Symmetry: none
Subunit: 46 residues, 35 copies
């Protein structure tokens, strides 16, 4: 025998792996305009 | 199975795509007078 | 559906269109004496 | 049989759809002066 | 039925409409001297 | 509705109209001796 | 009811009315020597 | 019968109505110097 | 009964009244040299 | 997709094209007397 | 739309047209004795 | 695995590349009259 | 209300009136020997 | 409206009218001996 | 496009053409007695 | 109450009154040699 | 035994190492025009 | 890539090329009478 | 009780009193050569 | 009887009274250099 | 008892006292060249 | 590792190298007429 | 034991050491033309 | 006897000792760019 | 007995003492270029 | 390109060619009696 | 203990000491031609 | 108050009074031989 | 690299070379009658 | 208190007093030969 | 305590004392030829 | 370490060394005709 | 320490020493014919 | 290094050498008839 | 202290002392033939 929290509690392990790709696209994408927003919004001003 | 943060959390992905056109018209338009404002406001002075 | 930043965030679009007429009258009018100020103030000197 | 969280827990699905129109009018409207506030408040200064 | 964020959350809609008249009088009035301040303060100098 | 930069931002419009009469009396008056200063100061020399 | 930004936010309205008299005496007075400074300082030179 | 959250939970309804008058006097009053603070503090500088 | 934000939240009302006298002496006094600084610093130059 | 600073930020491009004709008439016209002012004012002197 | 530097910035255009008549009377008049000053002052000498 | 800030956060990288061409046309174009403004405005004066 | 550049900016108006009497005594007095200098210096020569 | 260089810049117009009477008395008077100086000084010589 | 210093800066071109006729009448006329002054003044002497 | 920019911002009012006496002694004194410099430097030359 | 926050909590350690290269390219690139923007935008002005 | 100050900042390059022809006609033309003015005005005197 | 911005915020009141003596010595001293610089540098030239 | 939140919950009432004196000395003292910092740091610059 | 924000929160009181000596040496020293920079940089120019 | 401000922040290094050639052509070219303008405009006068 | 902010928080210590060399090359290089820009741009003018 | 919460409940005592080294590396490392981020990101801007 | 928050909760007391030396080196060091950045970056400009 | 002082500055070239015919008639004509004046006036005397 | 802004914030103290030698060579050197530029450029003219 | 150009600008008034005695001795003395030079040099010739 | 004031600032070098031929024809030609004017105008007189 | 432009701005007052003795020796001395130059250079001629 | 702008801001006080000796040698020396330039250049002419 | 304004800010040092050769050729060359212009233009006149 | 305007601003000191030899050769040489021009041009006339 | 007024300002040195041969031919030639004019015109008279 | 126009502006004092010996030799020498020219040229005539 063993305790079964180990193989099966782990599924979450994928719960956190999946968001990296879409999860990031949201900040990757929010952040995306976030830094560009400074120049795109900034440089014509001078 | 899979986790469904991926197809459906993505809708936001359009939340950020839509502002580029109107979102920009505001700085595009604020910025619009912002650079023109310098010459239009500047050159008659000399 | 769509996101509604597009029709309604646009109202500002008129916020920037209105000043062109009064907004300009101020520099149009400040600038107005600004270039005239040079000759009107300058030419009698010679 | 099935579990009934699916048809009936969904009503909320409209709870989030309704605010897009009024919900946005508040930022659409707060934001509305928010970008216009910069030029309307800015350009006469030059 | 419907959700009631729509009729009643809207009251704010007037919260933003009222300042346009007094709200503007402050920049309208701060700005008021702000552009005039340049000539009134500027032109006697030449 | 409309935006109120137009009736009330205009007050400055008088800020620039008033100096023409006193504003000019200063150059009108500085300039006044400025051209006369040349003959009044010049012609006895010959 | 109404929102009370309108009667009470207005007090500033006097904040801008008061400086016209002292506020001007400073440029009225700085400017005062500013134009006179040119002739008073200029004309004896010829 | 009915459920009594409706007549009696409403008392709060006055909890929010009362601050508009004093509640505003604080921003009305903080804000009061806040816009005036710019000219009163600004215009003598020129 | 009534809600007591009204008599007692008001004390701040004096928090803003007191600075007008000392509060102003600082800009009144910073500003004090600020406009004088221009002539006192300017006029000997000509 | 693309970023929209390019078509719409360009409007200014006309902001600078328009002054060439009126903008120049002011120096064209200030300058106009400026060179003529030398002979018209100069040659009778000899 | 158009930019309004063109109709309204032009007012100066009259700022330069008006001096030709008075503006000239000053050199017309300073110059007036200026050439006459040579003979009127010169010819009796021989 | 890797972290995905690297491929997707980069899009901004084009946000800054695009303005060089239009972005510059504004100073390229504001600056354009800016240096020319000195001779075009200067040389007839001599 | 009115703008107060008009009564108080005018003080200069006396700044220019005072020099006529002393201001002139300097050319009146420099010029004084200036024309006399020609005969007083000239006529004994013949 | 009009520009006020015209009524008030004109005062000089009298600046040049006054010297004709005293202004001339100086050459009228310098010149006065200037032609007489030739005979008065010349004729006894023969 | 072109730069507009060329058609409009040229007006001066007439500023110099006009004096030839009146401008000359002054030397034409000052010079007029100037050469005649020698014989008219000279020949009776012999 | 009142706003206190009026009694206390005024101190500058003396900042400008004091230089008239020393302030003038500098041009009064620079100017002093400035007009005298012409005769003192000029008349021995003839 | 030991506690396992140490080997596995560390993965973040790479979360911060990766942005240095792309992370910097954004300021490296925003900053990139940021300093160049001053000369490129500045020097033609003189 | 490259920086675009080089092709587009250059337009000014024509701003300076155009005045040579009209620009010169003004001194070419002011200067024109300027040297001729000496003989035309000088030689009849002898 | 009272609010303590009044006795203790005032210390600055001396922050502005101290510079008058050293603060002035800098312009008093920069200005010192500034007016003297004109004659000391000017008068030997004649 | 009564409920005892009233006499004993009040002790805090002193918790807020004590900071006014030290609490203020920190902003009184931070603020202290904060306004003085502007002139002390500003005026020598002119 | 008492509340202990008073003796111990005060340590900061020295946090602000220490910078006056080094803190000032930085502006004392930045400012140091700042006023000297004007003459040292200015006077040789004349 | 290292920090990457060093290779990539440097790109600007070319931002400043490019203007030397076009950047100079503008003053090289403005300056170009600027010194020539003195003789070309000066020497015929004698 | 000790707290580990001391060895490891320090890495930044190099974050600030690295820019001195590239960081300076940007102002060293912007500033580079900045002082040279005055003579290179200035001296041919005389 | 004794109660055994004392030797064995203590193991946690190491639970808190271990994070100081890795635990800190995360803020040590997050903080690491956090302060450096200000200069590295700030100084090229001037 | 006593409560043991007093000897052992205090360890933090060193948590705050340690950063003063490294903690300061970061602002000491960020600030370090921060004031120097103004002159080093400023003075060559004049 | 070339510099245009050469074709257009030349017009004067005719300014000097025209007087030879009228210019001479004045001395040709003044001189005309000038030599004849000796015999016509001389020979009858013997 | 003490606060460590004092030893370490001071490094800047050298930031300002170093420019005196190179910093001056730029004005020392710009200024260098600046005064020499007047005679070297001036004296041959007489 | 009054303007102080009047008592103190007057000192020059003595600048012109002093030369009459020495100033004249130079022409009085140059002129002195100037008329005597004719007889003293003339009469022995007959 | 090098600085480009040297090849391109030189163009003026031709600005001064061109006038020698036309530039001289004006004095060559003004001077032309200038010496001839003495004999042509002189010798018949004897 | 008072403003300290009065005791310390006055030092210049000696800046103008010192040149009278050396300052005059230059014209006293330039002028010295200037009147003597006429007789010393003139009288032997007769 | 006191504020330390007074001992340390004063260093500039020497910044202005040092130029009097070298600072003057430049005008002392530019001026040196400046007055001598008139006689040395003038007197041989007679 | 050291601060790097010293090796790299120096490049300007060559910015000022290069113009001496071309920079001078412009005045060397403008001045070149400037002194020659007097005799070449002067001596034939006698 | 010292301020370095003294050793290095002095270089100009040679800027003025060098022209004495060439600088003089121009007037030495212009003046050279200038006095000789009178006899060489004068004496054959008798 | 050296200053380059010396080799290149010298070109004028030839500007004065060339006229001796043609320059003289004009007086050599005007003077030529000038002395001959006396006998050629004189001797037949006896 | 003193102002240093007095020892060093004086050098000119020798600028005027040196010409007396060579300066005079030119008139001493021009004048030399000038009086001798009358007898040497006159007496053989009788």
């Amino acid at each position: 025998m063993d305790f079964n929290p180990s193989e099966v509690a782990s599924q979450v392990t994928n719960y956190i792996q999946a968001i990296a790709a879409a999860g990031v696209g949201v900040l990757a994408l929010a952040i995306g305009l976030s830094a560009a927003w400074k120049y795109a919004k900034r440089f014509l001003k001078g």
